[PDB]
Design a protein around this nucleic acid. Structure first.
Length: 54
DNA sequence: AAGCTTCCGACCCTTTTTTCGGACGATTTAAAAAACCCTTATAAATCAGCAAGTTACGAGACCTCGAAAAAAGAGGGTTTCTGGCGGGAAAAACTCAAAAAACGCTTCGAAATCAACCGGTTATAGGTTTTCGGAGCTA
């Protein structure tokens, strides 16, 4: 399972999103990450982002 | 000798850093302009309290615009409370059947009886007091 993530967030939300994703993948651009990851991990990732969405 | 691969020089273009120049501001110094002083007897201002007439400054009010704060509206999400539907087990009606059990025939003669009133029997409605079961609690 191989993932590519992009963020269109802005203002206060962008900082929070960076706070989460940076702990799961190396950053490849200003707003994008790319990494391999297991299915369970990805589920945890989405759950975490949802928990504090704006 | 030829082809492939790799450096190297020449150049082209744009961005990033440095240097220089120019301009503007600030400060200092010098020059120019406004001003101060010294001579005045005579003319005008000083001021006394109050009247009579007027207003420059203060207060009130409203408007105007702009911005700030608050409230509302929107959207993202999670947790839970309820309702509907589906599924398995138990109950009870429904269907099928037998075997008793009652009823009738049908009893002339043997109990059953009601009545009022006494004493006596005792099931139990109702209330009173109490073990058993469960509360979970805690590692």
């Amino acid at each position: 399972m191989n993932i590519l993530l992009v963020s269109q967030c802005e203002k206060r939300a962008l900082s929070e999103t960076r706070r989460i994703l940076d702990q799961f993948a190396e950053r490849r651009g200003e707003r994008t990450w790319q990494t391999p990851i297991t299915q369970a991990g990805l589920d945890t990732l989405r759950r975490l982002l949802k928990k504090s969405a704006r």
